[PDB]
Design a protein around this ligand. Structure first.
Ligand SMILES: *C/C=C(C)/C=C/C=C(C)/C=C/C1=C(C)CCCC1(C)C
Ligand SMILES: [Cl-]
Length: 207
């Protein structure tokens, strides 16, 4: 099982999700963007494009462009469910972008300064979790019982799984380089598929 095989698997999974969401169908267009963008990133990586050598590790640049564009769309989807005003959107999307940019920069820096960048993303992530579990949950409470229930289920899926990524990053090549690239990639392909396509199908089921 090679890296390219794992990338192709993620590509296929994102494509199936993309077509499913497009067929079912603001919410549906967002889900198409979430999995559609990831599909492209995985194909590019499957073709061997964007594999950037950094010191002694290999960094996958399309992954971070993907995350920077798709994760704010996931937060946007959750913000619509919760009924956020256009100002609360700005805070959480700003916090999200800090996490994503810090990870991208830390991965691309060869020296230990990269752990300083990782730490900053961790701090901003804790602030993002606070807004999901607190203010956004208060806001979602004002909606119908079914919408509130859908928000809580997507929120917990999001919080629990997103919290695993920084550990995979740190244990993988970008960090202490403990986990091997193949295992590290396999774990992230699984998480990407669940936080995007699984996320989407839970929404379809409730609709
Ligand atoms: C579809 C892709 C998803 C949901 C990716 C999520 C990625 C994260 C939640 C990554 C978080 C990170 C930290 C909290 C600190 C810095 C390193 C990151 C980017 C792995
Ligand atoms: Cl990476």
């Amino acid at each position: 099982v090679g890296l390219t095989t794992l990338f192709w698997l993620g590509a296929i999974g994102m494509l199936v999700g993309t077509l499913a969401f497009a067929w079912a169908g603001r919410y549906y267009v967002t889900l198409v963007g979430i999995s559609g963008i990831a599909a492209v990133a995985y194909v590019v990586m499957a073709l061997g494009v964007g594999w950037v050598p950094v010191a002694e590790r290999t960094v996958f640049a399309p992954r971070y462009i993907d995350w920077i564009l798709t994760t704010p769309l996931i937060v946007y989807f959750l913000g619509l469910l919760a009924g956020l005003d256009s100002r609360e959107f700005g805070i959480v999307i700003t916090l999200n972008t800090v996490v994503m940019l810090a990870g991208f920069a830390g991965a691309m820096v060869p020296g230990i300064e990269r752990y300083a960048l990782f730490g900053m993303g961790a701090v901003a992530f804790l602030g993002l979790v606070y807004y999901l579990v607190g203010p956004m949950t208060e806001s979602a409470s004002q909606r119908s019982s079914g919408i509130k229930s859908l928000y809580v289920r997507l929120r917990n899926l999001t919080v629990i799984l997103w919290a695993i990524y920084p550990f995979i990053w740190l244990l993988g090549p970008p960090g202490v380089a403990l986990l091997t690239p193949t295992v590290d990639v396999a774990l992230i392909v699984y998480l990407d598929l669940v936080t995007k396509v699984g996320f989407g199908f839970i929404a379809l089921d409730a609709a």
